[PDB]
Amino acid sequence: MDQSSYIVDSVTVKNGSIHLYFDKAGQKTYERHSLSHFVNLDNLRANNTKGSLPINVIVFDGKSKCEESSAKSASVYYSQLMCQPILLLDQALVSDVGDSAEVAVKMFDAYVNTFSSTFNVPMEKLKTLVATAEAELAKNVSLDNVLSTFISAARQGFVDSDVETKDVVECLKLSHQSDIEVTGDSCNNYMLTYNKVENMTPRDLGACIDCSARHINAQVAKSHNIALIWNVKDFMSLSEQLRKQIRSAAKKNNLPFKLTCATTRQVVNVVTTKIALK
Ligand SMILES: [Cl-]
Ligand SMILES: [Cl-]
Fold first, then answer.
1. How many CA atoms within 13 Å lie on the side-chain side of 187?
2. How far apart are CA 143 and CA 148, in angstroms?
3. In this structure, which ligand is nearest to the CA of 247?
4. Long-range contacts made by residues 204-211, C-beta under 8 angstroms, separation at least 24?
5. Residue 191, class by beta-carbon neighbours within 10 Å (0-12 exposed, 13-18 middle, 19+ buried)?
6. Are 229 and 200 in contact (CB under 8 A)?
7. What is the DSSP letter of 170?
8. Which partner from 9, 70, 231, 244 sits 20 to 30 angstroms from 163, CA to CA?
9. How deeply is 146 buried, as exposed, middle or buried, from its count of CB atoms within 10 A (0-12, 13-18, 19+)?
10. Coil, strand or helix: which one is 229?
11. Centroid of ligand 2 to alpha carbon of 269 (angstroms)
């Protein structure tokens, strides 16, 4: 790491996402997050509990004395806990991101784009359903209900009957939150040997065993151009920390990471160690 925190100079909001702009050695840069995190601002204010952060951002009061300094200091801990610089966001910059309905509506649009591109749906066979969904979002109907209803009505013909609607909902939600690629393919639940059984929580080790996750070796993967593909329910059974580490180990070795809504499994076509105890 060069710096363990960076000051957010500006923000822009578009398509249910926010871009946080900062200077990195004289180079104007940004990181992207979903707007979801920026309605309840307090999950982002550094609390007393070590906890962890949903994303690598800390919000602070710009008028307050010692709230920036406390953030900068707290973020030399958080930067090590999550292996990312922490962006320090003056809460003044994120006062007008849209209404909680305006947010719901914009995220919903991203869910639709991902759903048609993923299952190859003509955007025109959706628009009656989309119009209905958006109208209910403005009546404060749960985003999570609107999406589930939309999928139940749009899936027929396009989504294999052996895929549960609730696994599609959850691919879509997670795909927009962390910008993860979504496929319908069979899962392999492979993860890189980089993440070690030894330091896993019992939840983590138990959960990997439960979905028959298997360790793969970096050069074996890079050689066979092997996508790591996780069933979304099995992926979300892991700890948030572990989920990030699996994905960052993949992106460093330039291996595509995909969530799937399928519970069918890839052929074991490669040297894989399956997870177990010692
Ligand atoms: Cl329904
Ligand atoms: Cl993320």
1. 24
2. 9
3. 2
4. 204/238, 204/239, 204/242, 205/275, 205/277, 207/234, 207/237, 207/238, 208/238, 208/275, 209/275, 209/276, 210/234, 210/237, 211/237
5. buried
6. no
7. H
8. 244
9. buried
10. strand
11. 30
d(CA 118, CA 185): 10
- How many Å lie between the centroid of ligand 2 and the Cα of residue 213? 22
Which two tokens mark 134? Answer: 């958006």
Task: Pick the ligand that lies closest to the CA of residue 33.
Answer: 2
Q: Which residues surround ligand 1, an ion (CB under 5 A)?
A: 149, 152
Q: What secondary structure does DSSP assign to 22-75, as a single string?
A: EEETTEEEEEEEEGGGGTSGGGTB--SS----SSSEEEE-SSSTTHHHHHHHHH
What resolution (Å)? 2.2
**What phi-psi label fits residue 65: left (phi over 0), alpha (psi between -120 and 50 degrees) or beta?**
beta
